[PDB]
Design a protein around this ligand. Structure first.
Ligand code: FES
Ligand SMILES: [K+]
Ligand SMILES: [Mg+2]
Ligand SMILES: [Mg+2]
Ligand SMILES: [Mg+2]
Ligand SMILES: [Mg+2]
Ligand SMILES: [Mg+2]
Ligand SMILES: [Mg+2]
Ligand SMILES: [Mg+2]
Ligand SMILES: [Mg+2]
Ligand SMILES: [Mg+2]
Ligand SMILES: [Mg+2]
Ligand SMILES: [Mg+2]
Ligand SMILES: [Mg+2]
Lengths: 100, 117, 97, 136, 137, 86, 91
RNA sequence: UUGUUAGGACCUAAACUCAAUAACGAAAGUAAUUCUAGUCAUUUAUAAUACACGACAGCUAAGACCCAAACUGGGAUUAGAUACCCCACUAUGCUUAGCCAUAAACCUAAAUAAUUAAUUAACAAAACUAUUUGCCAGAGAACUACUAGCCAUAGCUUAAAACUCAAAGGAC
């Protein structure tokens, strides 16, 4: 049985390295009006806006392309003892993935 | 970039004399202040002066200043609708930004904690 | 024990530190063209480090050079020389709306 | 009648005490289960405190040896134009193939990092992968 | 191919002329706007007096002498004397930060003078004379 | 006094928008801090009072600027409720 | 009832059903005015159906969830469901 | 008198912006420019009856004087107004020597070396160990009386008792 240490070393997330300005594939699982909730394989989903072009194409289950920025949006503020987190990830929707 | 707060307050770490002496603790509150009311500016002030200017020459006789009197009504008639239309729509929409009440409720969904959980 | 355990080391991906627009350059009082890029075109006032974007060290070098140049008959005090009104803009500021 | 003091002892110790006291006449149903299969740590209250002075945490930064190679690859070529798929458990990215080849050459005995980086680029070029040396 | 807020540079060649006059030649309107009285003087580019006015000379007195409408009247009066003397374009150097700082320039516009530029010469000492003590209220 | 006249604090009127020229002139003097300087030079501020004021303004700027960050940091999470009804 | 410890087992049991209906309509994918001259039941009427007491905030949330159901594509089962909470206005 | 002066003289006084900076100095204090002189190694803590300093105000002699300004005079306000507001003007703030040695001289937190768990009287700027010196022992009487020292003479440091009370005080 593979060890947890081995699993982590060869994990896709460990291979990604820093997540800033990386390209990843996500999946839309929830849509509220023109807001798309996209799972890109991380801890937290991201929330993007439906593009004007090919808006109807972005339906639930649609795999898309993204440019990650943060896996979790967090920041300590003046007088805080802990980082405030919004339980959300940061990414830029680039467009649909070609099925090919 | 927020100013530096290192070596400003009077503390047992700081070797030198303090720079900043805050009246109140420097901890972000979970509310925003109530924005103080803003008032507008006089509308049709120029057109009123023109009307009044003509009267002075013509002994306050409306016969001479018939055209100017109609311009004063025109500006007031436009502004009358403008104040009506803008209060009904723009103020209700609050589209551009949040109000103090709406902002504070969002600041309370992710509140600042100066104490350990 | 385990070959796959992580190895202590310094961060390989650590990002480089940002430098100021005058990092490792010589600020001279006689270079009035460069000094004029950090004053106001209308009043000639020195900009603060939240406008020039300089570090503490280079901000003080520019301040000490503008005053020396202004005091030694090289630079005007109440405005920016009209010659340098066309030079590159390196200060975050907009008088016009 | 109970022990609503959750900062002294634990639910098990306070339940043990209430039975010794004489107030609780019937064992709770969860009691014997805890006695036979207790948790690893006793659930006792501890007030969180800040660290002060030179006290520091004990968390190891996770850096494998491949990161030295991966850091150079991202700085020289950026992220592979092919998009990462983090849903496939066995996904092989353009960078991970670079690191697999760089390791293979290093096993042969090449000792110069410059030699291993330009040779690996040539091998992937033969494979047909499109590596763009984007300084931008 | 755009307008320049910055004034022409003295000692250079420019294409900007007003009424067949260069920038250095256009007469200057000196407005001293204080917190009590707003004075106005118009001079030729050789520093020769052409018009003079102020809220006081118009006839305002005490607290009325320091209102916006009082300076507006003074500017219109200064324009009339200057317009008679042969002045159509003025360079407005407005000293002072009082109530009739803008009103005096607005009166000059109402009086038939064409402002081509606005300078500010409010005294700003660089360290100078100790000001009078703060008033308690 | 020894400098050249009409270069400093001078604006040019564009197509007869004298009010715009005045409004730009004031924006310059306010942005450059001359307005506050002349305002505070009417009377004398005592050295202890000046230091108390600068400490106050710096602490306010620090608070206001940081408060803006939290507002902008949470601006994105203000969206339609995805989990309405639960 | 599995929601006994909520304190409003019947209000939350109803809000559980309507939220599950909404999810299937949203996952699975015409004019919505199938019924006209009707009103949503008042809080007093809802309280009687649930045989429990509600707050004004509890009523307001229930209506918003029911409206969202109407917005979405509705099979005849949903139309019968929302009908239960629509009272024919005796204009 | 006033406004303008790309006119002349003066070099009195004070140092905008930079400074959203936080450096230097034992403290007091110190930020216009230039140059000269210049801070530096005692293991560390610990000192008076000695030595050297010490904001502001004040004193002595001679100068300076733009502006500010106790006092004083005039105007107003008020029942009165020895005030708050307005005007004028002096001691004084400046320089050269000497004196005086006091501040909420307080960052109300002595200095030094640690420690951050075995740890909330309240509030403030988290708790706490060791070392050495100084200081405190209910409030008022009392920054007083007397004594001695001092360039100080309506002064500074040093500093009681009688007598009175059953509280005073701190935080909430
Ligand atoms: S950041 Fe290097 S000198 Fe400014
Ligand atoms: K203090
Ligand atoms: Mg306080
Ligand atoms: Mg004169
Ligand atoms: Mg002169
Ligand atoms: Mg030297
Ligand atoms: Mg009197
Ligand atoms: Mg004198
Ligand atoms: Mg003296
Ligand atoms: Mg003392
Ligand atoms: Mg002090
Ligand atoms: Mg005393
Ligand atoms: Mg005494
Ligand atoms: Mg004595």
């Amino acid at each position: 049985v593979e060890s947890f240490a081995s699993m982590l070393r060869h994990s896709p997330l460990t291979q990604l390295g820093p997540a800033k300005d990386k390209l990843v594939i996500g999946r839309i699982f929830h849509i509220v009006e023109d807001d798309l909730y996209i799972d890109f394989g991380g801890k937290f989903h991201c929330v993007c806006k439906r593009p004007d072009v090919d808006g109807e194409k972005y339906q639930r289950g649609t795999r898309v392309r993204l440019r990650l920025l943060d896996l979790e949006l967090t920041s300590r503020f003046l007088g805080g003892t802990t980082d405030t987190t919004i339980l959300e990830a940061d990414a830029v929707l680039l467009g649909l993935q070609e099925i090919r | 970039a927020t100013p530096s707060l290192r070596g400003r307050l009077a503390r047992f770490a700081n070797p030198g004399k303090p720079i900043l002496k805050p009246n109140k603790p420097l901890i972000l509150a979970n509310r925003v202040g109530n924005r103080r009311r803003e008032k507008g500016e006089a509308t049709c002030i120029t057109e009123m002066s023109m009307m009044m200017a003509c009267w002075k020459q013509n002994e306050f006789r409306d016969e001479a200043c018939r055209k100017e009197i109609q311009d004063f009504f025109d500006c007031s008639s436009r502004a009358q609708e403008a104040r009506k239309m803008r209060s009904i729509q723009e103020s209700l929409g609050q589209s551009e930004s949040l109000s103090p009440h709406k902002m504070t409720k969002l600041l309370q969904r992710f509140p600042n904690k100066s104490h350990l959980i | 024990s385990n070959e796959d355990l992580p190895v202590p080391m310094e961060n390989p991906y650590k990002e480089p530190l940002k430098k100021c627009v005058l990092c490792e350059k010589r600020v001279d009082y006689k270079n009035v063209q460069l000094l004029s890029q950090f004053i106001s075109p209308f009043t000639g006032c020195i900009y603060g480090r939240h406008i020039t974007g300089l570090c503490g060290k280079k901000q003080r070098e520019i301040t000490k050079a503008i005053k020396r140049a202004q005091k030694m008959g090289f630079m005007p005090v109440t405005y920016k020389d009209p010659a340098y009104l066309k030079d590159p803009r390196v200060c975050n500021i907009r008088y016009r709306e | 009648a109970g022990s609503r003091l959750e900062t002294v002892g634990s639910v098990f110790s306070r339940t043990r005490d209430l039975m010794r006291a004489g107030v609780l006449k019937e064992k709770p149903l969860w009691y014997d289960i805890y006695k036979a299969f207790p948790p690893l740590r006793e659930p006792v209250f501890r007030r969180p405190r800040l660290r002060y002075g030179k006290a520091k945490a004990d968390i190891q930064d996770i850096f494998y040896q491949e990161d030295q190679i991966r850091a150079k690859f991202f700085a020289t070529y950026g992220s592979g134009q092919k998009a990462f798929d983090l849903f496939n458990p066995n996904f092989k990215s353009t960078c991970q193939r670079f690191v697999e080849k760089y390791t293979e050459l290093q096993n042969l005995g090449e000792t110069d990092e410059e030699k291993l980086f330009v040779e690996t680029g040539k091998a992937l070029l033969a494979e047909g992968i499109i590596l763009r040396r984007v300084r931008e | 191919s755009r307008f320049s807020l910055y004034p022409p540079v003295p000692g250079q060649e420019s294409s900007l002329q007003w009424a067949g006059m260069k920038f250095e030649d256009v007469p200057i309107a000196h407005i001293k706007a204080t917190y009590n009285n707003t004075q106005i003087q118009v001079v030729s580019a050789t520093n020769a007096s052409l018009a003079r006015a102020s809220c006081g000379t118009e006839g305002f007195r005490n607290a009325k002498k320091g209102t916006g409408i009082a300076a507006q009247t003074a500017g219109i009066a200064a324009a009339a004397k200057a317009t008679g003397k042969g002045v159509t374009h003025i360079r407005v150097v407005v000293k002072g930060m009082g109530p009739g700082r803008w009103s005096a320039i607005k009166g000059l516009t109402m009086g038939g003078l064409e402002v081509i530029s606005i300078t500010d010469n409010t005294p700003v000492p660089h360290x100078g004379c100790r000001p009078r003590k703060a008033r308690r209220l | 006094a020894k400098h050249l006249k009409f270069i400093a604090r001078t604006v040019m009127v564009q197509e007869g928008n004298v009010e715009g020229a005045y409004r730009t002139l004031n924006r310059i003097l306010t942005t450059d801090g001359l307005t506050e300087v002349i305002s505070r030079r009417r009377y004398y501020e005592k050295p202890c009072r000046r230091r108390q004021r600068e400490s106050y303004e710096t602490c306010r700027r620090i608070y206001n600027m940081e408060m803006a960050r939290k507002i902008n940091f949470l601006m994105r999470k203000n969206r339609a409720d995805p989990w309405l009804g639960c | 009832h599995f929601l006994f410890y909520t304190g409003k087992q019947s209000y939350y049991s109803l809000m559980h059903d309507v939220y599950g209906k909404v999810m299937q309509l949203e996952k699975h994918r015409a004019e919505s005015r199938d019924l006209i001259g009707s009103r949503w039941l008042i809080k007093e009427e809802l309280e009687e159906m649930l045989v429990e007491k509600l707050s004004d905030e509890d009523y307001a949330q229930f209506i918003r969830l029911l409206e969202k159901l109407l917005t979405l594509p509705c099979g005849p089962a949903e139309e019968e469901f929302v009908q239960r909470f629509r009272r024919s206005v005796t204009i």
